[PDB]
């Protein structure tokens, strides 16, 4: 538990809620007004989100998902499923997005347990994640600390505030709008090694006062579902071709890399990645949906799905016709307000429209 | 099972505007036979209420208009790409498993 000092009592928003009294007791107050209900402040897109997504689809050595062993395989189908699963696990365990999944799940699990247990006390929660290096040695990494506040969470939408401190090697002034809510302090001269010999890049601690809800914590600790949404889709893409060729196409798609899908764009034009890159990209998309989930994402997803279906019908020479196209565009555009993930998704949709009609 | 009293007044009031009694409406419905009311009403209805099908061609859909306000800022509960991890190559100390010890 952390001592309830003035700095923590301010950063954790203690006593900030106005005292609740019956209307007959304050009906005459001059400034008494209904709660503010204005629209969210609009914001434009930035390259940092796209850069972060690119990073999330990268390959690493630290494996983040060690799965408990299932019962022994007996049926030949079980042996084939195990052989495939191997490729899926090897491809998805080294993905950075899996690192985000493991760290996010641990943080939300720790926050929920501490919230239900120490309702009235500030708690220090280390952000510890476990991985396995290339040589197989098990390594334990610390990303920083979280100070959890008062957690009298009655409703499923109540908010618990917490101060998060994250070690980093990044100049906040270099890109300031990305860190508008953070207070970054230089805390050390880390002797990172590189190859020349050693670099003394300074450590930047991003101290920010964040907040999470009970429902948000519950959905956060279930972020492992992302591993299913991507892999199931990938399997559906594998099993379809296997049905067509009547042969197991796992080795052909992963090792031989005979088949490739359009997964990105560059100055030269659309870039095509193998099944591994597709799986990593779909996983990263699902992970970011979980991390940046919001009502705007739900609205834009539904409306853009309608537009995607219309464009698909057009591509299939189905002579699609609309009754009010501007109405649909307005519905899609009303959902692009503040969330960086939704703005990035809209930019991706614009790129897809550009590439799908030419 | 008879409708009477307050129920009867409520029933008499919950009818189309040209009716004023539940029994009158029930009698009208029992004797009702189609005589082209739909065709007549469709002819009478204005010609501007239509579901005109505007064709969707390769040049019709424009790009989505994104907001023009200030640049968006990080809102994740934790750092994603800028995070630095301090780690112990192999946990071999006493109390392994407890987060405070490892931290």
């Amino acid at each position: 538990n952390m001592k309830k000092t003035s700095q923590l009592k301010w950063a954790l928003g203690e006593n900030m809620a106005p005292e609740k009294v019956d209307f007959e007791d304050c009906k005459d107050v001059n400034d008494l007004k209904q709660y503010d209900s204005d629209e969210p402040e609009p914001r434009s897109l930035a390259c940092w989100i796209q850069s972060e997504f690119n990073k999330a689809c990268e390959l690493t050595d630290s494996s983040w998902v060690e799965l408990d062993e299932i019962g022994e395989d007996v049926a030949p189908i079980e042996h084939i499923a195990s052989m495939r699963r191997n490729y899926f696990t090897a491809e998805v365990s080294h993905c950075r997005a899996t690192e985000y999944i493991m760290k996010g799940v641990y943080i939300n699990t720790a926050l929920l347990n501490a919230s239900c247990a120490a309702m009235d006390d500030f708690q220090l929660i280390p952000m510890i994640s476990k991985c396995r290096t290339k040589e197989g040695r098990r390594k334990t990494n610390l990303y920083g600390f979280i100070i959890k506040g008062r957690s009298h969470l009655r409703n499923d939408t109540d908010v618990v505030n917490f101060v998060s401190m994250e070690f980093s090697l990044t100049d906040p002034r270099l890109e300031p709008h990305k860190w508008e809510k953070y207070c970054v302090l230089e805390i050390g001269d880390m002797l990172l090694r590189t190859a020349v010999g050693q670099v003394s890049r300074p450590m930047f601690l991003y101290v920010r006062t964040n907040g999470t809800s009970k429902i948000k914590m519950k959905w956060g600790m279930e972020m492992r579902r992302c591993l299913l949404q991507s892999l199931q889709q990938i399997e559906s893409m594998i099993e379809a071709e296997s049905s067509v060729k009547e042969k197991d196409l796992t080795k052909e798609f992963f090792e031989n890399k005979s088949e490739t899908w359009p997964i990105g764009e560059s100055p030269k034009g659309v870039e095509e990645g193998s099944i591994g890159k597709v799986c990593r990209t779909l996983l990263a998309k699902s992970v970011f949906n979980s991390l940046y989930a919001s009502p705007q994402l739900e609205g834009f997803s539904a409306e853009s799905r309608k537009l995607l279906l219309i464009v698909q019908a057009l591509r299939d020479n189905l002579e699609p016709g609309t009754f009010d196209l501007e109405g649909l565009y307005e519905a899609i555009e009303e959902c692009l307000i503040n969330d960086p993930w939704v703005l990035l998704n809209a930019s991706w949709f614009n790129s897809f429209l550009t590439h799908a009609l030419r | 099972f008879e409708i009477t009293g307050t129920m009867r007044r409520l029933a008499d009031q919950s009818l189309p505007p040209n009716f004023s009694s539940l029994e009158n409406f029930r009698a009208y419905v029992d004797g009702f036979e189609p005589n082209g009311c739909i065709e007549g009403k469709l002819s009478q209805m204005s010609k501007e209420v239509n579901a005109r099908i505007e064709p969707f061609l390769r040049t019709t859909p424009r790009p989505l208009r994104l907001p023009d306000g200030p640049p968006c800022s990080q809102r994740s509960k934790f750092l994603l790409m800028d995070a630095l991890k301090l780690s112990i190559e192999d946990p071999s100390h006493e109390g392994e498993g407890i987060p405070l010890y490892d931290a």
Binding site: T60, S62, E91, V92, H94, L191, R201 | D82, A83, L84
Partner: peptide
């Protein structure tokens, strides 16, 4: 099998020397 893709001191997982 090695998950592989054609695409120093990583700010995420660096060395300390």
């Amino acid at each position: 099998y090695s998950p592989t893709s054609p695409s120093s001191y990583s700010p995420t997982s660096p060395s300390y020397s």
